[PDB]
Structure formats: structure tokens, C-alpha cells
Enzyme design. Structure first.
Site, PDB file in Angstrom:
ATOM      1  CB  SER A  97     -71.648  51.616 -20.786  1.00  0.00           C
ATOM      2  OG  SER A  97     -71.069  51.836 -19.496  1.00  0.00           O
ATOM      3  CD  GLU A 113     -66.348  45.768 -10.291  1.00  0.00           C
ATOM      4  OE1 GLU A 113     -67.018  44.770 -10.002  1.00  0.00           O
ATOM      5  OE2 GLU A 113     -66.859  46.869 -10.407  1.00  0.00           O
TER       6      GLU A 113
END
Length: 265
Positions: free
Chosen positions: A45, A143
Site C-alpha cells: 500500500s 493482488e
């Protein structure tokens, strides 16, 4: 109270996994210290800061607007989307999407923003344009967090990410206003409490972004400093550990404590 490089090596032992670290002077860009600076790790992230960098660049160029409202559907929702799941009726503005992506690590917000630029390839092209030919985003969320051992998709090197972050926050790449927005978003991060923020004395400034993925992957990018002003960039990644999330968090927090306790050096 261990020296930071000692603590990073200790964190590798504790976690049974590679840890990558770098600390840069924000002003000069000088590398103050590092550990595995040129090895690749899953960015997870942490990419979402670079994504909002690319969006802000488009905004600066008149190709995008902070206030533009994007409506989306139930079918766009992916796991870990605490903000976007609440705005199916009203949608969200580009500004709100970057805020959700960075401050709450909203995965759907991130995918919506990727769509605005044309996908992960366009983020990678933006990075190549500003001189980072290492960092690469290949996949969408979630993913991109798969962290297959030794796979280069969706990776960076500590040194590449640190320099790219510096360029976004302080260079001429973005306008003054966009630079400030980007650091305001990272300052407002609510999702990285157990990491470097857990070691931070009151009065410090930190602007950061966390990430977690499979295979024990964990990391953080940050600009932080005493007296309400950032002065250094810190980048920490680990991948491969079988340790619990709490254990991984604590090792990063301890690296933070070390770098705080030796800052005045």
C-alpha cells in the site's frame, strides 16, 4: 538502546526475514544510513503515495481536478475499503479518494485513482519520467500485495522509494500547493499507529504511509522530524517473515525508537 543499524539486523533475526532500511536528510537528499538499500521488496500500500503524486501532477497540468466527483458501484469494491464502501450513492471526489487511499489505506479508492490515470502501467510511466526506473507497479489492489518470494512485480528498493518520496514532497515535480497537499494527506494517516508513530515523542511531525501484504510483508515510508517540521525520510520494508502482524509491527516500532533515541547524533 540499540543503534538503528544494530536494531535492523536484530529485526532480521527476530523475524527470520530480510529488512530493508534507509534514512535520508530531507534537505540535502544525503543518505545518512542504510541497510539493504538496493534490494527489492514489495511496496504493498505504500504505492498509494506515489499514485496520488501522479494524480496531483495531472491536477497541476489541468488534466484533473481535486473536486471532480466519481460515482462507482458495488462491483468496484475490493476488500479493506472502509471509506469507499460508505459512498456508493454519492460517490467521492478525487481529493477524497486520495485522502481515503493514503489515510485509511482504502484499496478501492486506490483502484479508482488508478483508473483515473489509466492503470498501473501509467503510474510506472510517471515514475520513469521523473527518473525512478526501479519502482514498478504492475497490478491493482489487492493482488499487488501477493509478495511471491523474489518476484519483482510491485516492488521498489529502499533507496529508490526514499529518493522518489523526497522528490514528490520537496522537489519541483509538483506545485507548492500539491506538494503541501501530499504531505498533509500523509500527516493525516490514521492507519500506522503501531509503527513509527508509536515511538514518536510529542511535538514531532510525521507524515507516513504503511503497507502490509502476504508472506509477512510489512513496511512504511515517512517524512518526520522534531519541532513540528520534517527533516528526514525513513523507509522500512520487510518480506518473508512468518511472524504475526503484531510481531512485525513491534520490530518496526523498535527500529523507530532506535532512530529517535539516536537522532541528535
Amino acid at each position: 538502546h540499540p543503534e538503528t543499524l544494530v536494531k535492523v539486523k536484530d529485526a532480521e533475526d527476530q523475524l527470520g526475514a530480510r529488512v530493508g532500511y534507509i534514512e535520508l536528510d530531507l534537505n540535502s537528499g544525503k543518505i545518512l544510513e542504510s541497510f539493504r538499500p538496493e534490494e527489492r521488496f514489495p511496496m504493498m500500500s505504500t504505492f498509494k503515495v506515489l499514485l496520488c503524486g501522479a494524480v496531483l501532477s495531472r491536477i497541476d497540468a489541468g488534466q484533473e481536478q481535486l473536486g471532480r466527483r466519481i460515482h462507482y458501484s458495488q462491483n468496484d469494491l475490493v476488500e479493506y475499503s472502509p471509506v469507499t464502501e460508505k459512498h456508493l450513492t454519492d460517490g467521492m471526489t478525487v481529493r477524497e479518494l486520495c485522502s481515503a487511499a493514503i489515510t485509511m489505506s482504502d484499496n478501492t479508492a486506490a483502484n479508482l485513482l488508478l483508473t483515473t490515470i489509466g492503470g498501473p502501467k501509467e503510474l510506472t510511466a510517471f515514475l520513469h519520467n521523473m527518473g525512478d526506473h526501479v519502482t514498478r507497479l504492475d497490478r491493482w489492489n489487492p493482488e499487488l500485495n501477493e509478495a511471491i518470494p523474489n518476484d519483482e512485480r510491485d516492488t521498489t528498493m529502499p533507496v529508490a522509494m526514499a529518493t522518489t518520496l523526497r522528490k514528490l514532497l520537496t522537489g519541483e515535480l509538483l506545485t507548492l500547493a500539491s506538494r503541501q497537499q501530499l504531505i498533509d494527506w500523509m500527516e493525516a494517516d490514521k492507519f500506522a499507529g503501531p509503527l513509527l508513530r508509536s515511538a514518536l515523542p510529542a511535538g514531532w511531525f510525521i507524515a507516513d504511509k504503511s503497507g502490509a501484504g502476504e508472506r509477512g510483508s510489512r513496511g512504511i515510508i515517512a517524512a518526520l522530524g522534531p519541532d513540528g517540521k520534517p527533516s528526514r525520510i525513513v523507509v522500512i520494508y520487510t518480506t518473508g517473515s512468518q511472524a504475526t502482524m503484531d510481531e512485525r509491527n513491534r520490530q518496526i516500532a523498535e527500529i523507530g525508537a532506535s532512530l529517535i533515541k539516536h537522532w541528535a547524533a
